[PDB]
C-alpha cells in the first residue's frame, strides 16, 4: 500500500473547506471518530472535542464557512502504517472581513481501514487570536 | 538499539528543569541544534527560535527558573529511528507565585548520533497565557 491515508484525508479536507464539496471527507471520517482541536471555543465555537462523524462534519462545515486557505506549508511529517504526525502552516483569509491569518498546527492522526478514527490538533492559539482581533 | 533518544532527552531535561542538574542535557544537545518553541516572547522571553547548544541551554535555564513540573502525561507518541513526534501535557507550578499551570504541547524532534539536532514545539499558547494571567 503506497498512498498514505493522511494524504487522502488532506485532499478530502481541502475539497470540503475550499470547494464546499464534502463527499470525500464524509467517506474518510470514521463513524465513531474521536476528535479534538485544542483552542478557545469562545472565539472559535468549532474548536474542542467531538465524537462521531456527524459532529466532525459540522466542525468542518463551520470552518469552511469561516475561512479560505490559499497556501499550505508542510514543515515536518512523521508517517507510520495507520498513523501520522505532522506540522503544517495554513495561510488563509477570513470570510467577509478578508482578514489574513497564518495558522501553525501540529496534527496527530490514527486510521483504521482507511478511515480517520482519531485526530488531535494543537495550534499556536495566542498568535491566532491576536491575528484575528488584529490587536 | 533499544532505548530511544527521545526518552534520554526527556530524562535529561527533567533533571535540568527540576533539579537544576544540566550536565546530561548539555551532553545530549547538539552543538548546532536548530530549535524553536512557538509562543509569545513578550510574556515568555525563553520562547522562539534559537541556534546552537549555548542558546538552547539558556532557554532551558530560564524555564527551570520559572517553573517546577509535578506531573507529566504523554498522550501520543510516534517514534522513528532518528526522530520522534509527541503530544504531552505538563502540570506545573510557577516559581514564586506558585500559580498552577497545565501546558499541552506537541514536540517534533530529530536526532543524530544520539544528540538532539532539531526541535520544534507548538503549544496551546492562549490557554497558557490565560492561566498565567489568571484572567
Amino acid at each position: 500500500m503506497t498512498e498514505h491515508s493522511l494524504w487522502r484525508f488532506s485532499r478530502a479536507l481541502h475539497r470540503a473547506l475550499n470547494d464546499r464539496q464534502t463527499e470525500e471527507l464524509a467517506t474518510i471520517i470514521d463513524d465513531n471518530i474521536d476528535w479534538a482541536i485544542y483552542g478557545p471555543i469562545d472565539m472559535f465555537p468549532f474548536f474542542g472535542a467531538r465524537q462521531g462523524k456527524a459532529a466532525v462534519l459540522e466542525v468542518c462545515r463551520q470552518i469552511a464557512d469561516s475561512v479560505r486557505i490559499y497556501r499550505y506549508h508542510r514543515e515536518s511529517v512523521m508517517l507510520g502504517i495507520d498513523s501520522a504526525a505532522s506540522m503544517v502552516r495554513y495561510s488563509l483569509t477570513a470570510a467577509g472581513t478578508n482578514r489574513p491569518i497564518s495558522v501553525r498546527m501540529a496534527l496527530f492522526t490514527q486510521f483504521q481501514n482507511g478511515r480517520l478514527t482519531n485526530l488531535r490538533m494543537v495550534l499556536d492559539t495566542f498568535d491566532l487570536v491576536e491575528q484575528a482581533l488584529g490587536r
Side-chain angles (χ1 to χ4, degrees), chain A residues 16-70 72-111 113-123:
Chain A
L17 297 189
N18 266 31
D19 296 301
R20 321 300 306 264
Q21 292 159 6
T22 68
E23 302 69 37
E24 283 181 9
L25 182 60
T27 295
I28 200 162
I29 294 311
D30 190 80
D31 283 352
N32 303 115
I33 187 164
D34 182 332
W35 170 281
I37 301 165
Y38 297 104
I41 64 171
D42 292 349
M43 194 161 162
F44 310 103
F46 51 74
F47 288 162
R50 301 299 186 277
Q51 312 309 314
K53 171 165 94 159
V56 164
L57 289 173
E58 174 62 16
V59 163
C60 291
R61 180 196 70 67
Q62 293 173 294
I63 294 167
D65 275 356
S66 296
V67 302
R68 168 160 214 110
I69 302 135
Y70 67 88
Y72 298 72
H73 187 246
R74 216 97 195 183
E75 293 170 344
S76 322
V77 180
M78 303 194 185
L79 295 186
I81 294 177
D82 282 315
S83 62
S86 65
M87 177 107 96
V88 317
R89 226 205 337 140
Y90 272 13
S91 310
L92 63 86
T93 120
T97 58
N98 283 5
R99 183 53 171 189
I101 298 170
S102 168
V103 185
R104 183 178 265 108
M105 310 166 291
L107 177 72
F108 298 72
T109 50
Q110 299 285 335
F111 304 86
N113 285 315
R115 295 191 283 279
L116 183 68
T117 58
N118 197 294
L119 180 147
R120 292 297 187 271
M121 176 184 289
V122 189
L123 62 145

